[PDB]
């Protein structure tokens, strides 16, 4: 019930996965999502994200409410990621840029 939002796109640091007790993170080309049914809400991944893109479902910003359903539907099609990887090459350039959902890759 924790949701990855907008600032993850084009950053994808992947520090979030090393602290997940249940391995419920699924990866896309430039984005990660959380499988809402497997997540146990221990909140351990939220302070680990450099993009600060992870939020508890009831705390997801009003203008990013879309990502709640997005994480559930993409967690169903993307592959499981359980290990840390290097961030995307220009992650710091995109950290803090808004409306990055227009750059989301399936
Ligand atoms: S809140 Fe806990 S169980 Fe849910 S995705 Fe984050 S680390 Fe994994
Ligand atoms: S940028 Fe994305 S890959 Fe994890 S560390 Fe943050 S939710």
Swiss-Prot record:
Residues 95-106 have a biased composition (Basic and acidic residues). Keywords: 3Fe-4S, 4Fe-4S, DNA-binding, Electron transport, Iron, Iron-sulfur, Metal-binding, Repeat, Transport. PROSITE patterns: 4FE4S_FER_1, 4FE4S_FER_2. The keyword Transport applies. Residues 1-29, 30-59 form the 4Fe-4S ferredoxin-type domain. [4Fe-4S] cluster binds at residues 20, 39, 42, 45. Ferredoxins are iron-sulfur proteins that transfer electrons in a wide variety of metabolic reactions. This ferredoxin could play a role in regulating gene expression by interacting directly with DNA. This is Ferredoxin-1. It comes from Azotobacter vinelandii. The lineage of its organism: Bacteria, Pseudomonadati, Pseudomonadota, Gammaproteobacteria, Pseudomonadales.
């Amino acid at each position: 019930a924790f949701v990855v939002t907008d600032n993850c796109i084009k950053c994808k640091y992947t520090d979030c996965v090393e602290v997940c007790p249940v391995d419920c993170f699924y990866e896309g080309p430039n984005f990660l999502v959380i499988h809402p049914d497997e997540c146990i809400d221990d909140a351990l991944c939220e302070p680990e994200c450099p993009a600060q893109a992870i939020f508890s479902e009831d705390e997801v910003p009003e203008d990013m409410q879309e990502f709640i359903q997005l994480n559930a539907e993409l967690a169903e099609v993307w592959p499981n990621i359980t290990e840390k990887k290097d961030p995307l090459p220009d992650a710091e350039d995109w950290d803090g840029v808004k409306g990055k959902l227009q750059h989301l890759e399936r």
